[PDB]
Amino acid sequence: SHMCLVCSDEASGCHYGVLTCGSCKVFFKRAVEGQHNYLCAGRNDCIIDKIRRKNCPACRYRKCLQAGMNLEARKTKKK
Amino acid sequence: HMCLVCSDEASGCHYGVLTCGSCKVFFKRAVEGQHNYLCAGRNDCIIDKIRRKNCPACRYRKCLQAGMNLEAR
DNA sequence: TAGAACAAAATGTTCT
DNA sequence: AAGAACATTTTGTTCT
Ligand SMILES: [Br-]
Ligand SMILES: [Zn+2]
Ligand SMILES: [Zn+2]
Ligand SMILES: [Zn+2]
Ligand SMILES: [Zn+2]
């Protein structure tokens, strides 16, 4: 267990509840805090991996949610 | 009137094709620079004004296929 | 019409 | 672990 669950690159730790690399960490934070009105140019199942994760922010963010990322994971594991 | 690659607003005829300024500039960069664009779908993404930034592989392919060529005039 | 430059958006890394 | 600040990459506009 040492892979990012969103893009399958090398995980750098748990962030927002999920083992992810640092790039998905800050992507998710930015997506959750701001606008994430993204539009898939395919069929909403683009392949999110180390080279292609730049391609589709819409599917990357759905992959984050699917993997379970959530901003209040910190205060969550406190319960 | 409208870009042949991404359906944005065509600014004129660039490298052989009626394209927009985004696509014009994207095209030169694609062929001159070196990157390896890989499609994350099915090699058939939708390239419109918003989605053109998502898949440079498909955008680039659309460019070539629409006849864009650095050598034209 | 093409380039250059400039500017902005989107992604990723370091935190001596 | 979470997040700021820094840094890069990628895209788009404008002014030659
Ligand atoms: Br920078
Ligand atoms: Zn990742
Ligand atoms: Zn997608
Ligand atoms: Zn275009
Ligand atoms: Zn594509």
What domains are defined for chain B?
Answer: 1-73 (3.30.50.10)
* Cβ atoms of residues B5 and B20 within 8 Å: yes
Cα gap B7→B4, rounded to integer Å: 6
Burial class (CB in 10 A: 0-12, 13-18, 19+), A18: buried
Nearest residue, CB atoms, A51 vs list B38, B47, B54: B38
> In this structure, is the dihedral angle defined by the CA atoms of residues A23, B52, B43 and B31, taken in order, positive or negative?
negative
B24 touches B5 (CB < 8 A): no
Experimental method: X-ray
In terms of Cβ atoms closer than 10 Å to its own Cβ (0-12, 13-18, 19+), residue B14 is buried
Q: What is the dihedral of CA B67, A47, A29, A23, to 10 degrees?
A: -80
Which pair of tokens denotes residue B43? 């090699």
Question: Between the CA of B36 and the C1' of C10, what is the distance in angstroms?
Answer: 18
Residues 6+ apart with CB under 8 A from A26: none
Cα of B64 from ligand 1 centre, angstroms: 31
Cα–Cα distance for residue pair B24/B54, rounded to 1 Å: 17
E strand spans, chain B: 12-14, 17-19
